[PDB]
Amino acid sequence: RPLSRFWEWGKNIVCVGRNYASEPVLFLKPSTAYAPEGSPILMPAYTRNLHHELELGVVMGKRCRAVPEAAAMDYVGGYALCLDMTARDVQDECKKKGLPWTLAKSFTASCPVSAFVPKEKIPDPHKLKLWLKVNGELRQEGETSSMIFSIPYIISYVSKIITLEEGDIILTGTPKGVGPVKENDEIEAGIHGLVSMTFKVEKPEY
Amino acid sequence: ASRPLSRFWEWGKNIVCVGRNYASEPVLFLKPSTAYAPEGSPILMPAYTRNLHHELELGVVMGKRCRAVPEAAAMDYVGGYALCLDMTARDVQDECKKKGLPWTLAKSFTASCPVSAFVPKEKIPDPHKLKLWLKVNGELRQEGETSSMIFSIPYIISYVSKIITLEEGDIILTGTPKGVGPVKENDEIEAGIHGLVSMTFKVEKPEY
Ligand SMILES: [Cl-]
Ligand SMILES: [Mg+2]
Ligand SMILES: [Mg+2]
Ligand SMILES: [Mg+2]
């Protein structure tokens, strides 16, 4: 289907652990973690500390299996700005117990996502500037130039472990200033000169 | 438009697996859609493991968008079933557990969820009265009865659905009985549900 609405039909979401200040740590979100603009961030009932993580997402334009770094950028279709919503308290316990990160990282609406930005609009994804506000006040700022692992290497690396389909996305890590959000909070985020997006923290209607 | 559940592995977006469910709440982790290996495709061995285990599991293919459903309604959201193998780099898993890292390299690599033909819901009135088996070069290594599952199926559905909305075509593997063990290049795994379905897989290294 069309990359401009890739969150509607894309199957997989792969997320790098730390990529800002030896190999990347990888974890997954289900497709239902996607919350496109106009849809709320949903707070799980089991957390009392949900954090925002501002991240550049790389959307795969064709099927990508064990590709070398230099070819990796041919498999990219575009990009989207994401929040890797994280139940931080659950994560701390998972690290402690050797448990999978699912409840901390992989719940419904745990990946809010901007409009699709075609790769023609971004000649270099390592020269972008990211930002995020909670209730109008600046909280996360990062430059993608300060990423530890480059996007070509991240694509190559995960493609050698997990084949990526067209429409799959890779979240490439968060810069500094990660912190909490509560019910009714509003998160505004963007890439300077390219895209912006608004989201509202909300409880489920169960 | 709509694709058949008989080919759910072709279009299904998500795989959710339960940890220990045989002899307080389930452990959950995920595989990517590209973990699927339908019959005819090889179990691929990741180059970084020296201890790839099999795990015989009943899968549960969802038939209807399933968002935070109660246990008593859960079975209405099921489309059918498939027998799967939760292929696991156990050596990588131990290290993941130790460092408190994600289980991805252990449980979510390519071809790490071999899958049988789809069994419609009508053919299985009670999914807890099934018998599963698995052979490795002819030797019976896994034997389970789904009645001895700790968490029932309707609960597992009601539970994961509260955390993760499940689509049409998504599957939940409901854990593996005893008899888990390793495999190696050129081994031929066969496994089935008694009277319902059977499958065969060759273990290979990738043509990377
Ligand atoms: Cl995990
Ligand atoms: Mg998926
Ligand atoms: Mg992150
Ligand atoms: Mg398992």
Layout: helices, strands, pairs:
2 copies of one chain form a homodimer.
Chain A: H1 6-9, E1 12-16, E2 26-30, E3 34-36, E4 41-42, E5 50-52, E6 54-60, E7 76-83, E8 86-87, H2 88-97, H3 102-105, E9 111-113, E10 117-118, E11 129-134, E12 137-143, H4 151-159, E13 169-171, E14 179-181, E15 186-191, E16 195-202
Parallel strand pairs in A: 1-13, 3-9, 4-16
Antiparallel strand pairs in A: 1-2, 5-8, 5-14, 6-7, 6-13, 7-10, 11-12, 11-15, 15-16
Chloride ion (CL) sits between chains A (27, 100-102) and B (29, 102-104).
Binding site for oxalate (chain A): 18, 105, 174
Subcellular location (chain A): Mitochondrion; Cytoplasm, Cytosol
Modified residues (N6-succinyllysine) (chain A): 97
How would you characterize this protein structure?
The structure is a homodimer. With 206 residues, chain A is mainly β. Chain A has one domain: Fumarylacetoacetase-like, C-terminal domain (Fumarylacetoacetate hydrolase, domain 2, Alpha-Beta Complex). Chain A is 13% helix and 35% strand. Chain A contains 4 helices and 16 strands. In chain A, strand 15 and strand 16 form a beta hairpin. The interface between A and B is large, with 40 and 38 residues. The structure holds chloride ion (CL) and magnesium ion (3 copies). Chloride ion sits at the interface of chains A and B.
